[PDB]
Amino acid sequence: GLDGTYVGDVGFDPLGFSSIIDMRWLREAELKHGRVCMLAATGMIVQDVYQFPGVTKSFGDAKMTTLHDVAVKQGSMQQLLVWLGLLEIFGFVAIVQMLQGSDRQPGDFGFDPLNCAANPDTLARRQLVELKNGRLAMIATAGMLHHFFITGKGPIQLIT
Amino acid sequence: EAQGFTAPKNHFASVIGLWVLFALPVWSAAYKQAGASNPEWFGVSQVSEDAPGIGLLAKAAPEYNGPSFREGLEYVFSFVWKPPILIAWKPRVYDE
Amino acid sequence: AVFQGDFSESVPFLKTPTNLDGSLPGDVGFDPLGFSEVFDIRVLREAELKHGRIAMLATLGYLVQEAYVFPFFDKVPPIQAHDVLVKSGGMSQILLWTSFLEIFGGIALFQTIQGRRYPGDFAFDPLGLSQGKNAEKLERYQLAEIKHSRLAMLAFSGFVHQGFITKQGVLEQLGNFKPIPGFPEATFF
Amino acid sequence: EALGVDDGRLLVPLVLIPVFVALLYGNFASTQDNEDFFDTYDQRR
Amino acid sequence: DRSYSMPFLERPPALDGSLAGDVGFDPLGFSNYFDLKWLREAELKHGRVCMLGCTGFITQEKIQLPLPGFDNKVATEAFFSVPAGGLWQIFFTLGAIEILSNGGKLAPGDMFADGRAPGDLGFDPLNLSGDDAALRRFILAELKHCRLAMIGLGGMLHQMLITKQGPLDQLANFQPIQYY
Amino acid sequence: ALRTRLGELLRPLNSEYGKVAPGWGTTPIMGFVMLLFAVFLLIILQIYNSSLIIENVDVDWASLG
Amino acid sequence: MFTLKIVVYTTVTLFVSLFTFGFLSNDASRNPNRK
Ligand code: CLA
Ligand code: CLA
Ligand code: CLA
Ligand code: KC2
Ligand code: KC2
Ligand SMILES: CC1=C(C#C/C(C)=C/C=C/C(C)=C/C=C/C=C(C)/C=C/C=C(\C)C#CC2=C(C)C[C@@H](O)CC2(C)C)C(C)(C)C[C@H](O)C1
Ligand SMILES: CC1=C(C#C/C(C)=C/C=C/C(C)=C/C=C/C=C(C)/C=C/C=C(\C)C#CC2=C(C)C[C@@H](O)CC2(C)C)C(C)(C)C[C@H](O)C1
């Protein structure tokens, strides 16, 4: 079920997920988790270093998960769910169109504002980078959160 | 505050009711004109077709030329008054 | 779609909706969940225009109602007026005449379904705008009407919802702009 | 007071039993020729 | 030769790959003594009834209609609070859906007499059952959701009867059984 | 002879008339069990007769309480 | 008193339903002159 064509194929599917689920879905998923995790890791690190202007007073010092429990009350989180959900409904259409025969390759939403992938070759190198950074990010995010659970400390603070 | 045929609320309800009645003619006709019925319109699932528990034929209907419904209820009753638990311990000429 | 592919103009990722063609005015190709596939586009167009034409009047009204009230009527925040007029029975008068016009409209929808009339044309052009001399303008106007309508429906929606949270009238909110009540003051924790 | 039902639980027998027996009758009714007959009574049974 | 689900036992004879959701699990062999079409219609109907029901237990707790007595968070408790007549009106409306959907052929012998592959009461408003391959895989999903929901509703009902708490609330503020 | 559902259900129970095991079969086992039963009957009889006094076995009305 | 009432209601409803649906089962056809 695992073949060379997908980018990033080192051939590692010990549990054989590929055999039961369409690779196009698995890939769209790996990128989507990765793209989210990269942003999450960046945010958790950014949050410790800087906060937006009025934020500290309303939320105080809560960080990581604790901030979420406080954030939901602000409704900052809701706006995030409603807008992100609106993007996702288009994303559901995209997976459906792709699963139905369609041109779009998994993970392609057509966002290249700076025309960075215009060279065909450079795109391939970037694609490998994106899965790899994303695979790392997910591992890191999980770690930062678990570290948080146990130490009650933000990751930059744990380094401090 | 009038009530019934002259009440404001019954009238708002009446317009909502008229929409419900006109919905079936207006939208069933719209659905009849082009509803689904597209080669390009088909459902999709991530799961592979070889995955276990996927039927060879859709909406399968077995003939079941077998014991009548009542006998099956008896088989289900024989579950509780004649299970095969003690046959396993069965022991292994005619006087004239 | 950074990888090359045939695709819809408004949204790069999705394919042009089937049975959605440039011919209806204001077609940027956005029907991400096909509704057009499930129900006929012309019946749907009649709806976009009807909602819009209703909405365009409503955006003007909510704003006008704030600034001015006809003298015989009292000045109250518009959402309140519906309650006042509904007790008054003014709203029933709007409902009755609007329903009568709508019954003529419902017959025209049936014709739209069976060929006959183009969606949304009631042939109401009393003025000469888009008259045979101005017939060239009709295609352009059509685009404006859908665009104004799409926008108005979003705008009214906005005025009413913003008004409920702010409890502040739309003209007032513009000139005095404040956060939703309590946010600057409140601390979640 | 209606049907002497002072306790809601009384409605369960009153509705479930007529329905269940109707279900038995539904099978008799479906196994019949329900086309019209033009006569005093239907001899098809 | 062998069931897939239960390797030790033999494949129930009646079960072949054709019905969907068939991994061979009919150990007690009900399949041999009843019509699979009757049995499937029941596997589906109990699930469809408990896909609506399980969603119902969760939704009722979070949101309740404005009308009086529709205010009890616990589903089991709510059955008593709501007006009895309304519950019968629901019974009857559902009862009509039964007769109209099955066309009045409502019994083991006649329901499937005309066509009606089990569970095809005709509700496919957005045609999604046009691809066959798609239909074969959606059908596994319905059964797998129907089977989970059955187990879930039983668990929620019994756990509420002990805790007098709705499913989400009990998980919050969980207390061991002795406390209740 | 009338055939009935209960008759067909119970027919194998009344099917092997005259079927016998060869020779003596389980006769020594029956004799041993009868000997044990005789010993048990003697024990209980001598207990009731008060010719056999086991400890904590007061054959008397006063043993009721 | 409630249990006796519910038993009586069950029995009466059962017998009345049997009567009603039995006379609905084309009773006129159950005559010796029917073909
Ligand atoms: C969720 C993230 C995710 C997803 C969807 C995938 C998906 C894929 N990977 Mg990638 N990968 C990931 C994370 C992920 N990977 C990470 C973190 C690493 C670094 C360790 C890698 C390293 C890697 C290599 C080196 C290779 C792949 C390959 C593949 C492909 C085939 C592998 C397969 O069949 O298993 C699919 C993978 C999964 C199903 C993930 C299982 C994770 C756990 C075990 C699941 C446990 C159950 C879960 C917790 C239940 C909760 C789910 C709930 C939240 C919904 C497939 C497109 C191969 C490829 O490119 O083939 C073309 C390949 O050579 N992956
Ligand atoms: C043309 C026919 C017609 C007639 C006879 C009426 C009659 C009435 N309407 Mg009106 N109405 C109509 C059409 C009509 N409506 C239409 C098409 C709409 C828009 C959908 C409305 C919207 C409307 C609202 C919003 C309200 C009424 C109200 C009323 C009632 C109060 C009358 C009033 O204010 O005092 C007498 C009227 C005046 C003092 C105003 C001056 C009228 C001048 C003198 C007459 C001019 C000619 C007249 C308009 C007739 C036109 C047709 C003619 C040329 C053939 C009254 C029963 C009110 C109500 O329900 O009562 C509380 C109210 O609030 N109506
Ligand atoms: C006027 C009301 C009405 C009518 C006429 C019908 C008509 C019908 N329904 Mg019903 N139904 C209704 C309302 C109605 N429905 C409502 C409101 C619900 C709840 C939402 C249901 C739920 C329902 C289900 C779940 C099923 C039906 C089925 C049927 C069909 C067969 C009826 C039959 O033979 O059952 C006569 C009655 C019985 C046979 C008694 C029920 C059997 C008991 C409850 C089984 C108990 C199993 C036991 C607990 C497990 C053992 C445990 C172990 C430890 C021993 C028929 C078309 C069945 C069907 O289509 O089958 C293919 C089916 O499976 N219906
Ligand atoms: C989806 C199933 C369903 C259908 C198809 C359906 C159709 C109709 C029709 C036919 C078109 C009418 C005319 C009608 C009228 C009323 N319904 Mg309604 N109804 C349904 C479901 C429920 C529930 C669950 C409740 C309910 C109620 C009422 C009351 C209030 C009585 C009162 O004022 O106290 C009135 C007048 C409540 C109730 O009866 O409470 C005592 C309540 O809980 N209904 N209903
Ligand atoms: C776009 C960049 C930006 C972001 C993403 C962002 C996010 C949040 C969040 C999100 C979780 C909360 C909860 C929050 C809260 C407050 N912000 Mg802030 N905010 C941003 C920018 C500015 C500016 C430019 C100002 C400002 C202010 C306040 C006040 C005022 C009252 C107070 O101080 O009590 C409060 C309560 C004003 C001010 O007075 O700051 C001292 C002001 O000028 N913010 N802000
Ligand atoms: C498309 C297009 C064109 C165009 C266009 C344009 C200009 C479109 C503009 C669209 C816009 C601006 C849409 C705005 C959506 C805002 C939303 C949904 C906010 C929701 C708030 C929520 C959910 C909340 C909340 C809550 C929070 C946060 C916490 C709570 O304590 C409080 C509260 C309840 C308030 C046009 C017509 C020109 C032409 C063309 O033919 C095509
Ligand atoms: C197209 C497309 C998509 C989409 C989409 C969207 C975004 C659809 C959004 C549609 C909307 C928001 C329609 C809104 C209509 C609002 C109206 C008609 C207002 C009426 C006001 C009235 C009658 C009033 C009033 C009042 C007045 C004036 C003043 C007061 O004193 C009184 C009163 C209160 C009575 C998606 C991707 C989802 C799917 C798809 O594949 C294709």
Side-chain angles (χ1 to χ4, degrees), chain A, chain B, chain C residues 1-188, chain D, chain E, chain F, chain G:
Chain A
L2 200 61
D3 57 60
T5 65
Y6 291 87
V7 291
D9 186 2
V10 181
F12 183 31
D13 183 2
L15 299 180
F17 279 143
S18 60
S19 60
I20 59 182
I21 302 181
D22 188 301
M23 285 290 300
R24 296 175 297 180
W25 186 272
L26 302 178
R27 179 55 49 117
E28 177 60 299
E30 174 173 58
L31 295 179
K32 188 178 301 180
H33 286 86
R35 298 173 179 179
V36 174
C37 294
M38 300 181 183
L39 300 180
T42 299
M44 293 154 51
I45 297 180
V46 172
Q47 294 174 181
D48 298 0
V49 307
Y50 181 33
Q51 301 180 2
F52 286 93
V55 180
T56 65
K57 299 296 300 180
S58 299
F59 295 154
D61 55 61
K63 295 181 177 300
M64 299 289 296
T65 299
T66 300
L67 180 56
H68 168 264
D69 302 301
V70 173
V72 297
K73 303 177 63 297
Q74 194 284 354
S76 57
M77 294 289 64
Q78 167 268 300
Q79 285 292 302
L80 289 181
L81 186 56
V82 296
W83 293 92
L84 298 182
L86 183 63
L87 295 184
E88 286 287 61
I89 293 187
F90 302 94
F92 159 88
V93 174
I95 65 65
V96 173
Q97 299 189 1
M98 178 182 59
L99 299 182
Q100 297 180 359
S102 296
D103 304 359
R104 181 285 179 179
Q105 289 65 3
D108 181 359
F109 291 89
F111 179 88
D112 182 59
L114 295 305
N115 302 60
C116 297
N119 180 241
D121 183 0
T122 57
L123 172 61
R125 182 293 182 179
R126 292 189 175 181
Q127 300 181 298
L128 181 59
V129 176
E130 181 178 60
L131 295 170
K132 298 182 62 181
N133 289 55
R135 296 173 178 179
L136 179 62
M138 308 178 187
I139 296 299
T141 300
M144 303 180 183
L145 299 172
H146 289 87
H147 297 150
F148 178 88
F149 302 148
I150 307 179
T151 63
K153 295 293 299 179
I156 301 300
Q157 292 181 357
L158 284 176
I159 305 301
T160 298
Chain B
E1 54 286 61
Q3 196 288 120
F5 286 91
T6 58
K9 300 185 61 180
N10 292 119
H11 303 152
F12 178 90
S14 301
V15 170
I16 304 299
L18 293 186
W19 291 340
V20 175
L21 184 161
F22 276 86
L24 303 179
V26 165
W27 298 95
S28 180
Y31 186 90
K32 292 176 181 179
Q33 282 175 113
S37 64
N38 291 357
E40 309 191 2
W41 180 273
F42 60 92
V44 284
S45 179
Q46 80 294 2
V47 188
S48 61
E49 62 177 0
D50 60 299
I54 300 182
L56 301 180
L57 60 76
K59 298 181 180 180
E63 178 179 60
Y64 182 76
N65 52 301
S68 63
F69 187 88
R70 184 202 65 179
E71 300 176 60
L73 302 181
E74 301 179 0
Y75 171 76
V76 176
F77 197 47
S78 71
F79 272 178
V80 313
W81 64 267
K82 202 229 306 176
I85 309 180
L86 295 178
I87 66 177
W89 301 115
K90 99 258 114 283
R92 287 106 41 93
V93 83
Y94 280 78
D95 237 324
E96 303 299 313
Chain C
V2 181
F3 301 97
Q4 56 62 289
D6 180 300
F7 296 99
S8 174
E9 304 177 60
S10 59
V11 181
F13 49 96
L14 303 179
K15 64 182 183 61
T16 178
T18 303
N19 55 58
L20 200 69
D21 54 359
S23 176
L24 296 185
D27 184 300
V28 309
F30 177 88
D31 186 2
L33 301 170
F35 279 82
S36 60
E37 305 196 2
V38 186
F39 300 94
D40 187 300
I41 197 63
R42 299 174 299 121
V43 174
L44 297 174
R45 176 54 55 119
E46 180 72 0
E48 179 178 59
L49 298 181
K50 292 186 179 178
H51 286 86
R53 297 172 180 178
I54 304 176
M56 288 177 290
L57 301 178
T59 294
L60 178 60
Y62 197 92
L63 304 182
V64 173
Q65 286 177 232
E66 294 185 0
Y68 172 88
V69 58
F70 293 96
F72 43 92
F73 290 146
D74 306 0
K75 179 178 297 299
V76 293
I79 305 299
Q80 294 183 237
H82 173 262
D83 301 0
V84 172
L85 287 295
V86 166
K87 298 300 180 300
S88 183
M91 287 297 188
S92 298
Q93 283 285 301
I94 305 180
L95 184 63
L96 187 61
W97 292 90
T98 299
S99 298
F100 176 86
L101 298 182
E102 196 74 0
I103 296 299
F104 299 93
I107 307 299
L109 181 55
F110 291 149
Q111 297 187 2
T112 301
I113 303 179
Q114 291 71 118
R116 284 58 178 120
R117 53 175 297 241
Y118 178 89
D121 175 60
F122 296 94
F124 177 87
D125 193 2
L127 301 182
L129 304 181
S130 69
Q131 195 60 242
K133 176 181 299 300
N134 305 120
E136 304 173 0
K137 295 186 299 180
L138 179 64
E139 190 68 299
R140 182 196 306 179
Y141 288 145
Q142 291 179 357
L143 175 58
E145 186 176 61
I146 62 76
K147 294 186 177 182
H148 300 329
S149 304
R150 297 172 178 179
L151 179 60
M153 298 179 296
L154 297 178
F156 173 89
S157 301
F159 300 157
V160 297
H161 290 89
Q162 297 179 182
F164 304 149
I165 188 59
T166 60
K167 297 299 182 60
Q168 180 173 302
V170 178
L171 293 303
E172 177 184 0
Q173 183 178 0
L174 299 180
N176 180 1
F177 181 90
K178 300 180 180 180
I180 283 178
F183 290 142
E185 183 286 358
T187 176
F188 303 93
Chain D
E1 226 106 72
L3 304 153
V5 171
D6 25 46
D7 184 342
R9 271 128 43 143
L10 288 156
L11 271 140
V12 179
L14 256 38
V15 169
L16 274 311
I17 304 176
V19 161
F20 169 77
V21 173
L23 269 179
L24 292 186
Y25 167 86
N27 190 26
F28 156 92
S30 67
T31 47
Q32 302 309 306
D33 276 63
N34 297 311
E35 195 227 83
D36 197 22
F37 42 92
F38 205 63
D39 194 15
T40 54
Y41 76 106
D42 190 11
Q43 307 187 35
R44 307 173 305 185
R45 181 253 307 172
Chain E
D1 180 60
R2 298 292 58 180
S3 179
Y4 182 30
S5 60
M6 302 183 63
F8 58 98
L9 299 185
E10 295 296 300
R11 185 184 64 240
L15 302 183
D16 300 60
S18 60
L19 294 178
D22 183 300
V23 299
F25 186 32
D26 177 59
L28 301 181
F30 297 87
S31 61
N32 300 300
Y33 296 89
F34 299 90
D35 179 60
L36 297 178
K37 300 180 300 300
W38 180 269
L39 299 178
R40 179 56 61 60
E41 180 62 60
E43 179 175 59
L44 296 179
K45 183 176 300 180
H46 296 88
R48 298 177 179 180
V49 172
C50 91
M51 290 184 294
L52 302 179
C54 260
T55 53
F57 300 155
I58 308 287
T59 300
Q60 299 179 0
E61 180 181 60
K62 303 301 300 180
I63 185 60
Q64 300 68 8
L65 298 180
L67 303 178
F70 295 30
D71 57 0
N72 183 299
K73 301 299 180 180
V74 178
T76 60
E77 299 300 300
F79 180 90
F80 301 93
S81 300
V82 173
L87 300 179
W88 297 91
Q89 298 179 57
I90 304 180
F91 179 90
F92 297 30
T93 300
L94 301 181
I97 304 180
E98 295 294 60
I99 306 180
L100 293 59
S101 301
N102 299 119
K105 300 180 301 300
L106 302 180
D110 62 0
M111 180 178 299
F112 301 91
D114 303 0
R116 293 182 51 59
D120 182 0
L121 300 178
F123 176 89
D124 183 1
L126 301 180
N127 180 62
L128 299 179
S129 62
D131 180 0
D132 181 60
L135 185 52
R136 290 159 57 239
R137 299 177 299 180
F138 295 148
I139 300 180
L140 180 60
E142 182 176 60
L143 297 177
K144 298 183 178 181
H145 294 87
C146 298
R147 299 174 180 179
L148 183 61
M150 295 181 296
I151 302 180
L153 178 174
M156 296 181 299
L157 181 64
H158 298 90
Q159 298 178 179
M160 297 181 298
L161 299 180
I162 299 184
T163 59
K164 297 61 180 60
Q165 299 180 300
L168 300 181
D169 179 60
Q170 181 186 1
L171 300 182
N173 65 67
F174 185 89
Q175 293 297 301
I177 183 181
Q178 62 287 0
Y179 172 90
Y180 302 92
Chain F
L2 178 63
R3 184 182 295 276
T4 54
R5 319 223 48 259
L6 190 61
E8 259 312 298
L9 176 64
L10 302 177
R11 188 66 187 272
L13 300 173
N14 198 74
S15 57
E16 44 194 45
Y17 174 80
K19 218 256 144 220
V20 299
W24 286 104
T26 54
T27 36
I29 304 180
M30 181 198 67
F32 184 75
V33 178
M34 285 193 301
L35 204 61
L36 290 181
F37 189 53
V39 173
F40 165 77
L41 290 180
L42 285 175
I43 290 178
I44 62 177
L45 174 61
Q46 293 190 20
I47 286 178
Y48 204 148
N49 191 260
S50 298
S51 299
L52 175 57
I53 300 97
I54 319 291
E55 284 308 307
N56 322 127
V57 188
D58 182 57
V59 184
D60 187 10
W61 285 104
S63 61
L64 271 72
Chain G
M1 268 355 156
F2 177 74
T3 166
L4 181 54
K5 186 178 186 178
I6 195 76
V7 165
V8 167
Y9 270 57
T10 292
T11 294
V12 171
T13 309
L14 172 62
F15 280 117
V16 167
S17 302
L18 286 181
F19 171 86
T20 299
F21 287 101
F23 266 144
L24 281 171
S25 305
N26 196 10
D27 188 75
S29 62
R30 308 180 187 274
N31 66 94
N33 243 151
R34 174 252 182 182
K35 292 330 271 83

